[PDB]
Amino acid sequence: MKVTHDGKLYIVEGEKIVVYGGTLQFFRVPRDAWRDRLEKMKKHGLNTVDTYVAWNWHEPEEGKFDFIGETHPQRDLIGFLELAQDLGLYVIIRPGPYICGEWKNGGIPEWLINKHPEILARGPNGPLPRDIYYPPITYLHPTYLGYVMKWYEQVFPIIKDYLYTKGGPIINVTIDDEPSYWETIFQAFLTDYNDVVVKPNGLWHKWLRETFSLDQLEERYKGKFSDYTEIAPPKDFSEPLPKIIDWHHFKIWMTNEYVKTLYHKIQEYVDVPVSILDPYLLLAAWRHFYNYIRKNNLDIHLWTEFWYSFYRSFDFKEDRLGHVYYKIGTYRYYVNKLNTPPLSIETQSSLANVIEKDEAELLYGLLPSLGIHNINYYLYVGGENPRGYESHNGVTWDVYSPIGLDGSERQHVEPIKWIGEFLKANKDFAYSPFNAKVAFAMYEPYEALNLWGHRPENFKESVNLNEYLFGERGLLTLLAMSNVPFDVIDLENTTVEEMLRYEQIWVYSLDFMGREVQDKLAEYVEKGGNLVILPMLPYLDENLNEYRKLEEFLGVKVEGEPARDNVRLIPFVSVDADGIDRMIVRNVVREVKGGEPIAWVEDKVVGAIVRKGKGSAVILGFRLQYFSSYHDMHRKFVDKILELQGVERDFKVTDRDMIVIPRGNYLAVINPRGHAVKGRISYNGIEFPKLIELEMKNRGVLFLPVNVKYGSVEVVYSTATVTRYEDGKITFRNHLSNTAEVAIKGDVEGVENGEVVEKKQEGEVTTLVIRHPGEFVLLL
Ligand SMILES: [Cl-]
């Protein structure tokens, strides 16, 4: 029968499942080894196998298709689908045409590029070099699209036959791969100057015509123009910044058009959910993706991925919390609006030299914590590249995969196993809320500036948002580490009504901010919102014309020298505040004039709070960042800002190094630090544990039940994660401490694999302290 969904979980024959998967690229693993690798995968508790189908592998020469391994054992797609169904695994199939994968041309046949070079995307002064990885292709070139349709016509009859709805194992089809214009969208002027794009009345002139009036282009580029065809694409940073942002948005539109063409062809063959991974390889630009699929009525499931370390030892510590909170807050914003299940189809399990289990646990544990409860680990099964098909790794496709090319099991399987068990045993976790009091509000054009690293010529503010916002010392890392879980909203898409769901919104500002955005933020405050804005107020609009509406509304001026980019000339400044002694900040600090002062550098006020209408705004003349110290003034200052604006955390911890992310009846409890944390949690009118403290000896993640029912018993609280429930047996796991506290409403028959060293009965509640080697069973 059917594959459907309820916006939290996929539903197969009307059964809710948690997709818990690994990637096994059949075409890079010996055929002799497939059954072995899939059985180990099942043994680790995976219910799904992901694989690409590579156009250039199954069509090695124009017209010569092989899906049965006539020609090479590993060309046997049919056989791989048959075995996956035989062992009772679901399949996610990603048939491209582009599959990335560190694979020659990202799946695009060499014969195609050699036959039709006219399809190749061009630089502004001529062709790109031909020996670069993933030779960039003009997506909308008719010859390219004609050849893709040829590929889809061959692989989609097979996919169709192995769909869950046709009796097969395939539950999802993914479009292309993180379509990014072949990873060229990171550079303003690398692509694409192909004739179809740039000829008079080409895609560029068409897009301008559809997006803008000439009267708008005149204000925006500050020229006169009597026709759209007079406007050449920008090729360098002498050109108006608005026109370069437009060029960026225009590449994203060609990508959207590409995807729509693929979706329409796929829809002729497929009646299961259709997905896409990380459009454009961007985050804030997902506003364009959302708008495009809404406008074009495309039922595409947005899925995401986590990559943190490339061709070095895996490095996943406290430093990453900003970026992960940001990326998953952004993802959570979009899948909540689209009402599709959150899924990470590529969770890093390879391409780092060594993946240490406590660092892997922190990443893997954070996905469900922040709302991604469907998980595929990439790459799960180590392989080897057939000769001719190498790109990024030469021979090897076993860079610390959970299962090696030799079939060994590596250390990061431990966290992969127990998280699966927990998600399977607690499907209610999938339906849990994320009740953020606080939002970070992102302004998408800033993403583009940060991406390119070009500081506009008279900008008073740095475009290094990796340093000041996203990275290891970023504002967002500070908020994470200050125990402020946050949502992410897009300032252009959000309505004031949506903004008013948040007790507090943080905005990072540069020189320019769109008029509609500057107005909504003022109205947010007017209507009872609490804005925090730094390290300046904008004084320009989206055309870079004077616009200071937010600054006139708040009645404050933020004056100071422009920020410096020469690392030697970046000043250090000590900021005092009530209860705060010389909090270090970096780069120039601005005088905040007006409001009630809350932060000063000696004589000078550098931070203030104002009340406007029903609400308040905190204006900081500096870049607040995550610095760690005994004195810990940065986290203390965040606390003061939330108290100033009356923002109330749903929870308290006695050790502020213990990160808690409340999820209704579950607490995601996180030690991100490489040291022990020990303390108690206050949540939902209770404080626990009461008899012992909650000890996390090292880095790791717990998911603790608070008032969760298991059959006729309720777990009032646990210092250990429930990994399994059978009739009368609950299994608890805590590898971070040898002492667990459990409070139970129900009849406790006993404990397997643990000794009860303490017991209290208060009315209906049995409380036990259990000493255990890392896992114990309660009998009820
Ligand atoms: Cl070979």
PDB file of N, CA and C and ligand atoms in Angstrom, residues 57 72 74 384-387, ligand 1:
ATOM      1  N   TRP A  57      27.982   5.562 -14.271  1.00  0.00           N
ATOM      2  CA  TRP A  57      28.327   4.165 -13.920  1.00  0.00           C
ATOM      3  C   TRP A  57      27.424   3.189 -14.690  1.00  0.00           C
ATOM      4  N   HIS A  72      29.899  -5.165 -15.036  1.00  0.00           N
ATOM      5  CA  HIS A  72      30.668  -5.041 -13.779  1.00  0.00           C
ATOM      6  C   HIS A  72      29.745  -5.474 -12.647  1.00  0.00           C
ATOM      7  N   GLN A  74      29.259  -4.560  -9.753  1.00  0.00           N
ATOM      8  CA  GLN A  74      28.734  -3.415  -8.975  1.00  0.00           C
ATOM      9  C   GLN A  74      27.834  -2.498  -9.817  1.00  0.00           C
ATOM     10  N   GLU A 384      35.432   1.514  -2.086  1.00  0.00           N
ATOM     11  CA  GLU A 384      36.597   1.616  -3.004  1.00  0.00           C
ATOM     12  C   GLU A 384      36.023   2.088  -4.339  1.00  0.00           C
ATOM     13  N   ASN A 385      36.729   2.959  -5.038  1.00  0.00           N
ATOM     14  CA  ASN A 385      36.231   3.578  -6.281  1.00  0.00           C
ATOM     15  C   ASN A 385      36.739   2.722  -7.427  1.00  0.00           C
ATOM     16  N   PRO A 386      35.868   2.228  -8.330  1.00  0.00           N
ATOM     17  CA  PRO A 386      36.340   1.578  -9.548  1.00  0.00           C
ATOM     18  C   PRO A 386      37.188   2.569 -10.349  1.00  0.00           C
ATOM     19  N   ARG A 387      38.207   2.026 -10.993  1.00  0.00           N
ATOM     20  CA  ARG A 387      39.157   2.770 -11.855  1.00  0.00           C
ATOM     21  C   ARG A 387      38.364   3.504 -12.939  1.00  0.00           C
TER      22      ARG A 387
HETATM   23 CL    CL B   1      37.404  -1.744 -11.191  1.00  0.00          CL
END
